């Protein structure tokens, strides 16, 4: 900058934007009754 003894005439300022996002996630599994009754292990569900 150079302020002469006269003066009379600059700076500005800016801001930026940040954007996120929420994404859904999940899964599942299935089993039959016979799988539980006739299984070698009796704690398979656990």
């Amino acid at each position: 900058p150079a302020l002469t003894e006269n003066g009379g005439r600059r700076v500005g300022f800016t801001r930026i934007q940040l954007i996120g996002s929420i994404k859904k996630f999940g899964f599942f599994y299935e089993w039959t009754q016979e799988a539980m009754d006739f299984d070698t292990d009796e704690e398979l569900d656990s």
Binding site: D37, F38, D39, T40, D41, E42
Partner: protein, 39 residues
């Protein structure tokens, strides 16, 4: 006909005629159980 039209002309007997149960002829023997777990 009669003096006036009658609505209900038949008594519905609540107790129904259901068939009996066939005699468990062959199923008159032992009942061994299978273990639920494993097996």
């Amino acid at each position: 006909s009669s003096i006036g039209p009658q609505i209900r002309l038949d008594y519905y007997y609540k107790k129904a005629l259901v068939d009996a149960a066939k005699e468990m002829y062959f199923g008159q023997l032992a009942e061994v159980t299978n273990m639920p777990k494993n097996m």
